[PDB]
Design a protein around this motif. Sequence first.
Motif, PDB file in Angstrom:
ATOM      1  N   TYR C 166       0.933  -1.073  -0.075  1.00  0.00           N
ATOM      2  CA  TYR C 166      -0.036   0.146  -0.036  1.00  0.00           C
ATOM      3  C   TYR C 166       1.053   1.357  -0.107  1.00  0.00           C
ATOM      4  O   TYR C 166       1.779   1.168   0.682  1.00  0.00           O
ATOM      5  CB  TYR C 166      -0.994  -0.022   1.251  1.00  0.00           C
ATOM      6  N   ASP C 286      -5.490  -3.034   7.428  1.00  0.00           N
ATOM      7  CA  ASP C 286      -6.343  -2.071   7.875  1.00  0.00           C
ATOM      8  C   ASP C 286      -7.634  -1.802   7.044  1.00  0.00           C
ATOM      9  O   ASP C 286      -7.389  -1.585   5.922  1.00  0.00           O
ATOM     10  CB  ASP C 286      -5.738  -0.806   8.626  1.00  0.00           C
ATOM     11  N   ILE C 287      -8.795  -1.577   7.916  1.00  0.00           N
ATOM     12  CA  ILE C 287      -9.907  -1.212   7.191  1.00  0.00           C
ATOM     13  C   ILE C 287      -9.642   0.054   6.260  1.00  0.00           C
ATOM     14  O   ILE C 287     -10.457   0.013   4.960  1.00  0.00           O
ATOM     15  CB  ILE C 287     -11.194  -1.023   8.348  1.00  0.00           C
ATOM     16  N   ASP C 288      -8.927   0.873   6.424  1.00  0.00           N
ATOM     17  CA  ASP C 288      -8.722   2.217   5.367  1.00  0.00           C
ATOM     18  C   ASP C 288      -7.807   1.742   4.254  1.00  0.00           C
ATOM     19  O   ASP C 288      -7.464   2.713   3.549  1.00  0.00           O
ATOM     20  CB  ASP C 288      -8.301   3.297   6.159  1.00  0.00           C
ATOM     21  N   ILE C 289      -7.233   0.776   4.351  1.00  0.00           N
ATOM     22  CA  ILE C 289      -6.152   0.065   3.236  1.00  0.00           C
ATOM     23  C   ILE C 289      -7.277  -0.860   2.106  1.00  0.00           C
ATOM     24  O   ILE C 289      -6.796  -0.774   1.040  1.00  0.00           O
ATOM     25  CB  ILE C 289      -5.169  -0.612   3.809  1.00  0.00           C
ATOM     26  N   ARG C 290      -8.004  -1.580   2.935  1.00  0.00           N
ATOM     27  CA  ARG C 290      -8.731  -2.648   2.377  1.00  0.00           C
ATOM     28  C   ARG C 290      -9.424  -2.172   1.065  1.00  0.00           C
ATOM     29  O   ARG C 290      -9.491  -2.779   0.105  1.00  0.00           O
ATOM     30  CB  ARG C 290      -9.875  -3.234   3.184  1.00  0.00           C
ATOM     31  N   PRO C 322     -17.289  -7.893   0.706  1.00  0.00           N
ATOM     32  CA  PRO C 322     -18.472  -7.082   1.267  1.00  0.00           C
ATOM     33  C   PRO C 322     -18.980  -6.536   0.039  1.00  0.00           C
ATOM     34  O   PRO C 322     -18.558  -6.209  -1.077  1.00  0.00           O
ATOM     35  CB  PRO C 322     -17.887  -6.220   2.043  1.00  0.00           C
ATOM     36  N   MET C 325     -18.765  -2.478  -2.281  1.00  0.00           N
ATOM     37  CA  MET C 325     -17.482  -2.525  -2.718  1.00  0.00           C
ATOM     38  C   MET C 325     -17.009  -2.874  -3.961  1.00  0.00           C
ATOM     39  O   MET C 325     -17.666  -3.937  -4.507  1.00  0.00           O
ATOM     40  CB  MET C 325     -16.478  -3.153  -1.764  1.00  0.00           C
TER      41      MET C 325
END
Lengths: 126, 160, 375, 375
Positions: C166, C286-290, C322, C325
Amino acid sequence: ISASRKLQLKTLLLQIAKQELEREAEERRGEKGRALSTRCQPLELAGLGFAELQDLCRQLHARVDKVDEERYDIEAKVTKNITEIADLTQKIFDLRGKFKRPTLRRVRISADAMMQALLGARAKES
Amino acid sequence: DDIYKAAVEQLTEEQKNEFKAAFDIFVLGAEDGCISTKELGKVMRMLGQNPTPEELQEMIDEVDEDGSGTVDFDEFLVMMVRCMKDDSKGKSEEELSDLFRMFDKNADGYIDLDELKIMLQATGETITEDDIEELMKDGDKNNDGRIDYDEFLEFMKGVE
Amino acid sequence: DEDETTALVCDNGSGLVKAGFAGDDAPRAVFPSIVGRPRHQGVMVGMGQKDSYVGDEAQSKRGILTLKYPIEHGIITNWDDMEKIWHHTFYNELRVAPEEHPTLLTEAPLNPKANREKMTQIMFETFNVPAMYVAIQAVLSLYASGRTTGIVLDSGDGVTHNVPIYEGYALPHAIMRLDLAGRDLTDYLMKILTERGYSFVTTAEREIVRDIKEKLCYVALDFENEMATAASSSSLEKSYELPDGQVITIGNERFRCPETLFQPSFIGMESAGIHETTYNSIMKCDIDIRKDLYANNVMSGGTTMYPGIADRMQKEITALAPSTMKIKIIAPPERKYSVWIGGSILASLSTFQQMWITKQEYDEAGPSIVHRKCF
Amino acid sequence: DEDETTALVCDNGSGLVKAGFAGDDAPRAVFPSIVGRPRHQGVMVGMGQKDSYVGDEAQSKRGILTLKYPIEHGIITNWDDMEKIWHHTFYNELRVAPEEHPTLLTEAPLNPKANREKMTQIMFETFNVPAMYVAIQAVLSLYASGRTTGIVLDSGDGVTHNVPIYEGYALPHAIMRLDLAGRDLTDYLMKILTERGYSFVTTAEREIVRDIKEKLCYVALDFENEMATAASSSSLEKSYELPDGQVITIGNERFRCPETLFQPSFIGMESAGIHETTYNSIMKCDIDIRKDLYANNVMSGGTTMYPGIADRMQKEITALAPSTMKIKIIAPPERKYSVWIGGSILASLSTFQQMWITKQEYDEAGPSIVHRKCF
């Protein structure tokens, strides 16, 4: 506008911008010499007495402190704008980048080597 | 797509006729008598190498200003002088800042047409408003009517 | 004969070695990672005949040679044979002596450290290379693909790495390395071809099955629907001409072999497949990477050269992902070659000039230096 | 880009920072009080990537950053991060060099004096501001709300101050300071969202819960009735969407988080809640003061945005208050921003132009001058 015309236009333009860079820089540098003579004015040492020269050295040393300080402030500001240039060029370069990447190939068999591997002796200008 | 004509302006004409004969054998066995994919392919093959028709048709289209799609013999000579080392060196951002502070006499970060006009009139070459106009427009991709500094990098990217 | 003292680049995998110069377009030559040796007694004399053959020599004379691969599962185990491949590669096809040229080699971050140490040591001690670097295949794949962010699914000959990157940073705890690769797909095909009546056991036979796979197999975007027809009609078979004039055909096996990538249990592997590993690499970030990794799954390497794979993977990850997305796949034509391509890009970057281990640094530190300076 | 050398106004809290120029109506930019730093090892070469990110940069690149808040319950302890926040605010967004403009900063009167001394110092010693003035947030709240008299209810993200002012004068013995604020309300929400099956612990996750609170939470006029209803029906549940496509459905946690302001035991605080302290601030004032404070209970700062808060506070104070007396709450739309507005009003008053500390009086006296010139 055809090809060779545009080539000459832009290369001569680059030369013109070079000449304007030259005039601008010589302006700046003449300004430097003149302003420097103006601010830090040469000393008047002839016949000066002993204690006279003691106190004069002290005053000019205070002058050292002042001018050094001030140019050094200009220096620190310049360094801040240096980091600013580096990091904003970095920033925009990245905004420029992600697709900006300039690269070279070599899949180009240059027409010298090309036309020689073709013509042998007959590739005289080729 | 034009710089090759500009380079042959610098080059000779004996190379043009050598490439006339080249084109002739470059279509030795051709389907279209011009350089399509496989013609350029047998060019590389007589060169001793084996190309793929995609980059073949691409170098075919690498000059394609109009969308001609093919290698006209004129476009052929264009493509063949493309490979001679004539003008190089890809001028770019640093010296272009050094020169853009000038070309932006207005110091806008953007060359207005004023500076470009004046410095062209200074170039010594004949100065058309096709010159200054195309130059403003190619510089200015934002098309602001003024060549931004990076639009000036565009303006003087590579033009030897 | 070169116009610059540039770096050399060689993607030395368990399959093939892609070699050329940094700053060029592609590899000048691609060699099998093979050293071949005769398995027969000679009768004629004054016939030349080598003790060993390398790369393309090994395949050209393979009719009586046993062919061995010095690299397996991403690691060189036979350093002597790789020195031989390299001497040939560099001096005979690239026409360069590494003594005057920095050289970049590649590996996966989860290969044993011995790989990077022997690659570095051979080039510094048998070739006297002025500098070395061992690169990350995932990084090279991202440069070639135009990305700084995404999951690199290299699907190679001996190993699949599966690493999330990332903004140019590794997320190493999220690497889902998988013991499934193109070499296993070949062995699987040999067994299923045997069920069809075409047994293959020796080297010549093994090299041909790999060639059959490469030309006849595909993965299918939807294997169940593909099977419903492929298992019902001969119209889905494709013929391959064997070197000896015999013809072999493949029916639904044509996609069931590649299907192993989505069914590792076919070769006895305890795994749900590459799309599961892709998904879990995203999950461990992490959720803000996903969100960025879902939008940037990157295919690189070979075995991604199967029709239906970009769509198969998008469906297979979308199925785990999910809703709302967007799941997207990058799968450029620079497939299988993208690591070499990235190698040339990295070796030649101005930002990479200080990443190189020089010969002086190597001689002072010894080979363990590669473990500390490259990555 | 400003056409006048007006004061710069910046309200720097433990949550957000509101920055703009005096004489205007609103801050020009709002930043979180955050400096972010990468917590991962770089893998790719030539990727740029900063050592630290500030304000909106810190949140924008947060996927791989740990995010730190320089302010601890109202006091700045990390001045390296605050000089970055201030430099960014002034240089990049307000487009001003403070050297050419006076600056107004804000803080409660019970905030350790060290913070107002340092706020005065950062602007004079790092930014060379020609003058300074650290303002009382309650003073600014009453100007913005059109009052000279009233109770300032300012629970923020850090602490709650609770201060009565009459005819512009403070009644300091009646200030009820509590270690009860939005950061603790958020921590309670993280624990109760964990009870529901959604465990949030990392920076990205902590920021999500804080965002959930801001968008979903409320108090309700009657807590027992809202509680009994939430416990009986799905009609009070509200959903929230997360960055990767996950969805969380929240029930009574939606008001149990805010409830902590009335029930501080939820976060381990020894307190009767904000209504007891709002009430006591009125009660500790003389009876000829109290009548005006009861009728002018003024909300400022954030958390005042919870629906039902103006009515619950008015009802609880009324329940605690003597009968006959009229209790009223002012809760203007200029909420969460009104302190900034008050800053603009104060900085620009002609009656305030003698209250500015110059970079002369400051240098002669030292940092302690703020205690004599500001508050």
